[PDB]
Amino acid sequence: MLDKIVIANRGEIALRILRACKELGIKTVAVHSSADRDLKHVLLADETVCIGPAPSVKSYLNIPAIISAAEITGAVAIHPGYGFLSENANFAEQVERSGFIFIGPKAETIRLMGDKVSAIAAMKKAGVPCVPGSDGPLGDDMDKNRAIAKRIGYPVIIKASGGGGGRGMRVVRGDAELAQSISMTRAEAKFSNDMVYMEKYLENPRHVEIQVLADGQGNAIYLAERDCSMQRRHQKVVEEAPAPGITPELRRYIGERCAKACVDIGYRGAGTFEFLFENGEFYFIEMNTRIQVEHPVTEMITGVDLIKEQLRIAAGQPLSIKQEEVHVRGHAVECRINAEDPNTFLPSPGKITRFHAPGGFGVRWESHIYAGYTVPPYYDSMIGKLICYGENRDVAIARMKNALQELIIDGIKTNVDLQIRIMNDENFQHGGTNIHYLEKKLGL
Ligand SMILES: Nc1ncnc2c1ncn2[C@@H]1O[C@H](COP(=O)(O)OP(=O)(O)NP(=O)(O)O)[C@@H](O)[C@H]1O
Ligand SMILES: [Mg+2]
Secondary structure, eight states: OOSEEEEOOOHHHHHHHHHHHHHHTOEEEEEEEGGGTTOHHHHHSSEEEEEEOSSGGGTTTOHHHHHHHHHHHTOSEEEOOSSTTTTOHHHHHHHHHTTOEESSOOHHHHHHHHSHHHHHHHHHHHTOOBOOBOSSOOOSOHHHHHHHHHHHOSSEEEEEEEEETTEEEEEEOSHHHHHHHHHHHHHHTOOOOOOEEEEEOOSSOEEEEEEEEEESSSOEEEEEEEEEEEEETTEEEEEEESOTTOOHHHHHHHHHHHHHHHHHTTOEEEEEEEEEEETTEEEEEEEEOSOOTTHHHHHHHHOOOHHHHHHHHHTTOOOOOOGGGOOOOSEEEEEEEEOBOTTTOSBOOEEOOEEEOOOSTTEEEEOOOOTTOEEOSSSOSEEEEEEEEESSHHHHHHHHHHHHHHOEEESSOOSHHHHHHHHTOHHHHHOOOOTTHHHHHHTO
């Protein structure tokens, strides 16, 4: 058991991690910005350290301040949660070099999977199915680039190797646009890294992703999949597990290839392989080398506490859970709750004047918010996650509708009414909508 850890994050995930720590008897240190003194998890933590002012560069991305916090409190480990420094290989390195356990993968693994070109090469070698592509960086010889395009078959997509957040990529539908599309992506994505690659452009994929756990001692398991196709500006809005239409046989096929890839790259901890799924086929696009926001839907359908497993792995324990003990049962849906004007979709901070959480069988509310809590203007819009589990998908969705109606968040604007609309959407109710659906539905 880890004696004491620094929770190097904020909001709902910081509270998520604190709960897992409390369950396991692990002492907690909440590092926070000066704008986050009233966070629920900070108020519940055993120790707290204000690591700097509101701007993340001097708080949640402040590597020296976070490491000093660990030093002053005599912590043994640091959990980076998601976002912020979780996939910063320099942070991981410095954490370990400074004498602390980094609750995540090795820095080399973060680098390997953090660069898209190197990540694709490793997956291709490991036998994970990848999107047909250039399999390496593009030069500026445009006879050669037109040849790669022909081999792949248009339409293709130009992607920045250091790209992220839906930025640094251009869809190319023919030769005439190829030259300019490569040159501009090479500029627009100069993220500082000019390196671009070419992928086949999949025109109606679903987002299907595979959860893994690996102990970094040779054992790896997969915990089924999630469908996260309901997106806006490439940002996920609803997630569910398992993915509609995925058979046990298909699940086992892609699951086993991901688990094997973990062994090949010496992966350690929780991670997620993200695929575009189209015409019954999986195509690798990215590995998130950290816990994911939507991890709860997988927890609901497998019974596995993913955060507690992260902590056990970090403590140096081998996986106790064998693959044959992992069973998909029932179905779960997650609705992200955002402090945003639904129409303009940009953050809406302010004091919550009335709050009521939903309850009931299968209802799980993941949020730091409370009545009188002020949502600050500085950080991400997501203030909570509503997760509903049922014996089947219909029951999960029915419970989500019921839970969303009970959820009261007054004083700020939220996307609750939108989540109600998505739950009531006939195509969502059928299932299997693609990554373009929500924007088409809304008019975006
Ligand atoms: N080969 C492809 N075909 C179709 N769409 C793609 C392809 N590659 C990326 N995309 C789009 O880009 C989205 C995800 O990008 P996002 O995570 O916002 O930033 P990114 O990490 O730079 N790109 P990615 O590598 O796809 O995760 C996908 O959900 C697709 O909509
Ligand atoms: Mg990445």
